[PDB]
């Protein structure tokens, strides 16, 4: 799977909010482009002159994520974050020249991402009370990954002593995205666990934080809530469910070729962090069938 790389796999079956620190600093921002940020401004002007209803929005930028030594007490992860925007994304990661910016960043800064916006996405492995994961079909008319399968998620918009509020907004944003798109009540959702961070190599390396969320509704009840919103209540064109039993071998199915890179990231991390048992009971051959 060349279109996704794992930046972080979390320990302990995934990390809760209270175990993560963020450092939000202008040191973690994108570097100005070699010939100046005028190239980003030109792409934005051209776009607005065709689609004048478009608007910019701020985004978090991922610089790096450092895990503590395994088994340690105290905070387990440090997220180094900057600020970027939808405009900077369209002028860098989504530019035809994005590969040239990656090479120039390696040359100038020893960092393939130094000249990239790299907005931080969020996604969820969302499990039902009857042990299915939730999948969404993307519209065939959108710009990125048209017609592909996705999981719930989005790209959160800003607003350890500014740090803890930023970690809170990240965890909050994955639940909000599930309520807005799947039409589920907030009180049916568990607090999220962070499983890891995955990179989309088809979008010049931009990263998504991938979370595990449990719902107290069955697959049938989740479907009812999604459909009862009507076509204008969701951006996706359909919902469907796969047994957690069958997610284990999803990369061997015909579904795998239809999954967008960030959803492949969510399923790989779910399989490594929530699946793949370590103990004698769940590891026994009748509960973990070989092959
Ligand atoms: N690739 C992309 C392009 C356009 C466009 O061409 O307007 C919109 C959305 C896109 N993807 C989703 C996204 C990525 C980064 C930040 N926010 C959202």
Swiss-Prot record:
It comes from the Eukaryota. Substrate binds at residues 55, 86, 138, 143, 150, 155, 157, 262. It catalyses: UDP-sugar + H2O = UMP + alpha-D-aldose 1-phosphate. The lineage of its organism: Eukaryota, Metazoa, Chordata, Craniata, Vertebrata. Hydrolyzes UDP-glucose to glucose 1-phosphate and UMP and UDP-galactose to galactose 1-phosphate and UMP. Preferred substrate is UDP-glucose. It comes from Homo sapiens (Human). GO terms for molecular function: GDP-mannose hydrolase activity; metal ion binding; UDP-sugar diphosphatase activity. Belongs to the Nudix hydrolase family. Keywords: Hydrolase, Magnesium, Metal-binding. This is Uridine diphosphate glucose pyrophosphatase NUDT22. InterPro entries: NUDIX_hydrolase_dom, NUDT22/NUDT9-like. Its cofactor is Mg(2+). PANTHER family: URIDINE DIPHOSPHATE GLUCOSE PYROPHOSPHATASE, URIDINE DIPHOSPHATE GLUCOSE PYROPHOSPHATASE NUDT22.
């Amino acid at each position: 799977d060349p279109e996704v790389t794992l930046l972080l796999q979390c320990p302990g079956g995934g990390l809760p909010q209270e175990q993560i620190q963020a450092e939000l600093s202008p040191a973690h921002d994108r570097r100005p482009l070699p010939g100046g940020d005028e190239a980003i401004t030109a792409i934005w002007e051209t776009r607005l002159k065709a689609q004048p209803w478009l608007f910019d929005a701020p985004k978090f930028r991922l610089h790096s994520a450092t895990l503590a030594p395994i088994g340690s007490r105290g905070p387990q992860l440090l997220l180094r974050l900057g600020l970027t925007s939808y405009r900077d994304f369209l002028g860098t990661n989504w530019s035809s020249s994005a590969a040239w910016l990656r090479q120039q960043g390696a040359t100038d800064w020893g960092d393939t991402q130094a000249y990239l916006a790299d907005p931080l996405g969020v996604g969820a492995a969302l499990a039902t009370a009857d042990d299915f994961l939730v999948f969404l079909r993307r519209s065939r008319q959108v710009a990125e990954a048209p017609g592909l399968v996705d999981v719930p998620g989005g790209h959160p918009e800003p607003q350890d002593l500014a740090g803890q509020l930023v970690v809170h907004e990240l965890f909050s944003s994955v639940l909000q995205e599930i309520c807005d798109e799947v039409n589920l009540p907030l009180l049916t959702l568990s607090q999220p666990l962070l499983l890891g961070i995955a990179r989309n190599e088809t979008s010049a390396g931009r990263a998504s934080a991938e979370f595990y969320v449990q719902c107290s509704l069955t697959s049938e009840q989740v479907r009812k809530h999604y459909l009862s919103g009507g076509p204008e209540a969701h951006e996706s064109t359909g919902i469907f469910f796969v047994e957690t039993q069958n997610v284990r071998r999803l990369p061997e199915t015909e579904m795998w070729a239809e999954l967008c890179p960030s959803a492949k990231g969510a399923i790989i991390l779910y399989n490594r962090v929530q699946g793949s048992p370590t103990g004698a009971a769940l590891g026994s051959p009748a509960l973990l069938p070989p092959l």
